[PDB]
Design an enzyme around this catalytic site. Structure first.
Site, PDB file in Angstrom:
ATOM      1  N   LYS A  63       1.166  -1.155  20.533  1.00 46.03           N
ATOM      2  CA  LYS A  63       0.296  -1.774  21.522  1.00 46.03           C
ATOM      3  C   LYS A  63       0.413  -1.059  22.857  1.00 46.03           C
ATOM      4  O   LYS A  63      -0.576  -0.889  23.567  1.00 46.03           O
ATOM      5  CB  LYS A  63       0.634  -3.254  21.695  1.00 46.03           C
ATOM      6  CG  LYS A  63      -0.462  -4.050  22.377  1.00 46.03           C
ATOM      7  CD  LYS A  63      -1.726  -4.037  21.535  1.00 46.03           C
ATOM      8  CE  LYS A  63      -2.857  -4.785  22.214  1.00 46.03           C
ATOM      9  NZ  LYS A  63      -3.276  -4.132  23.485  1.00 46.03           N
ATOM     10  N   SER A 168       2.577  -3.242   4.933  1.00 49.83           N
ATOM     11  CA  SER A 168       3.682  -4.016   5.480  1.00 49.83           C
ATOM     12  C   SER A 168       4.466  -4.690   4.362  1.00 49.83           C
ATOM     13  O   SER A 168       5.689  -4.807   4.431  1.00 49.83           O
ATOM     14  CB  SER A 168       3.157  -5.074   6.451  1.00 49.83           C
ATOM     15  OG  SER A 168       2.182  -4.530   7.324  1.00 49.83           O
ATOM     16  N   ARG A 170       5.036  -3.842   1.032  1.00 47.48           N
ATOM     17  CA  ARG A 170       5.942  -3.032   0.221  1.00 47.48           C
ATOM     18  C   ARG A 170       7.178  -2.600   1.006  1.00 47.48           C
ATOM     19  O   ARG A 170       8.239  -2.362   0.430  1.00 47.48           O
ATOM     20  CB  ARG A 170       5.221  -1.819  -0.375  1.00 47.48           C
ATOM     21  CG  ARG A 170       6.076  -1.030  -1.357  1.00 47.48           C
ATOM     22  CD  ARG A 170       5.262  -0.028  -2.152  1.00 47.48           C
ATOM     23  NE  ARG A 170       6.102   0.731  -3.073  1.00 47.48           N
ATOM     24  CZ  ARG A 170       6.541   1.965  -2.844  1.00 47.48           C
ATOM     25  NH1 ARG A 170       6.213   2.592  -1.723  1.00 47.48           N
ATOM     26  NH2 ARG A 170       7.304   2.576  -3.740  1.00 47.48           N
TER      27      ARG A 170
END
Length: 326
Positions: A63, A168, A170
């Site tokens: 971000k 995300s 796995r």
């Protein structure tokens, strides 16, 4: 004193805006990120450096970079008035920070303005329909249930067909933003034609709503972008991606789709130094160049049957998806 004024100044606005929107958890994440930035000796200009800070996690680092990379023009308005709106539009599916400024620039401040007075991509129009649902993360077990549904419907056509959830999930993370399901078959012949039949069966059953998004073609790989909802009450729409690949490209497709983004980026960099190139399709030798840089020979594709084989060829010890978070 504060070194990273260029990041915190716009983060304070984001933190305040999110608490008002009710997302108290994200507002806490920003506030803890802001504190970590102020308590830093040098200004952060990179993803890795932003990520290599005690207070800042992976999602937060992305971000910061997105904010940092956005930057300019930044001429419009003021951060108090602009940033919350820019963030608002950015979170819409199929919309970027530059696209956000475009709408913002025209004179749009709300989603209803976008809904009516703005030109909508087929992908972007779907974004508004399921905006609140796409905005939140999903629990891991829900994603586990999504993987199972796609698998059961796919295995109905072929017994030996294999479905593995990536992203995300796995990597063993607790929450997933979206779900990427990779499908293949050991022989490498069966997987063909299944892609079209599978989507129909799921679409018929009601699992897939707002079905279409361009279905893309990347050689052997077939990718479907779409949204999905589990049967039962209290279910919210989630993004789903279904990819069907041959077994030869499966090892490299797994590695690419598993992630992380920074992991792959480092793997490509690592491959480049060893004279190879890592694509999602296959691991191939780098294009042969002379001393002066003239391309004199094309690179050849290396056989990578399993995910472990890719690591060995790169001379890198195997790292499990949990250690690929980076």
């Amino acid at each position: 004193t504060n070194h990273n004024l260029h990041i915190t100044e716009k983060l304070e606005v984001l933190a305040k805006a999110y608490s008002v929107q009710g997302d108290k958890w994200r507002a806490l994440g920003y506030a803890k990120a802001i504190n970590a930035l102020k308590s830093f000796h040098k200004p952060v200009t990179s993803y890795q450096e932003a990520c290599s800070i005690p207070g800042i996690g992976k999602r937060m680092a992305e971000k910061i970079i997105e904010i940092l990379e956005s930057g300019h023009l930044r001429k419009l308005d003021h951060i108090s008035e602009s940033v919350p709106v820019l963030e608002l539009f950015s979170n819409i599916w199929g919309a970027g920070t530059k696209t956000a400024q475009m709408w913002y620039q025209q004179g749009f401040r709300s989603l209803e303005d976008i809904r009516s007075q703005a030109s909508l991509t087929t992908q972007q129009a779907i974004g508004l329909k399921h905006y609140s649902d796409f905005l939140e993360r999903m629990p891991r077990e829900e994603a586990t249930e999504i993987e199972q549904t796609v698998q059961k419907a796919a295995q109905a056509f072929n017994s030996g067909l294999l479905c593995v959830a990536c992203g995300s999930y796995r990597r063993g993370k607790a929450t997933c933003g979206d779900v990427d399901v990779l499908i293949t078959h050991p022989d490498g012949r069966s997987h063909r034609g299944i892609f079209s039949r599978l989507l129909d069966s799921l679409r018929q059953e009601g699992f897939l709503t707002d079905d279409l998004v361009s279905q893309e073609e990347n050689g052997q790989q077939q990718k479907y972008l779409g949204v999905c909802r589990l049967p039962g009450p209290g279910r919210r729409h989630r993004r789903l991606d279904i990819i069907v690949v041959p077994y030869s490209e499966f090892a490299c497709a797994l590695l690419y789709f598993t992630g992380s983004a920074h992991f792959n980026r480092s793997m490509r960099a690592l491959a480049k130094t060893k004279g190879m190139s890592l694509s999602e399709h296959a691991l191939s030798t780098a294009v042969v160049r002379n001393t002066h840089g003239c391309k004199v020979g094309p690179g050849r594709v290396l056989p990578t049957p399993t995910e472990k084989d890719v690591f060995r060829l790169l001379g890198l010890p195997y790292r499990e998806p949990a250690e690929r978070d980076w």
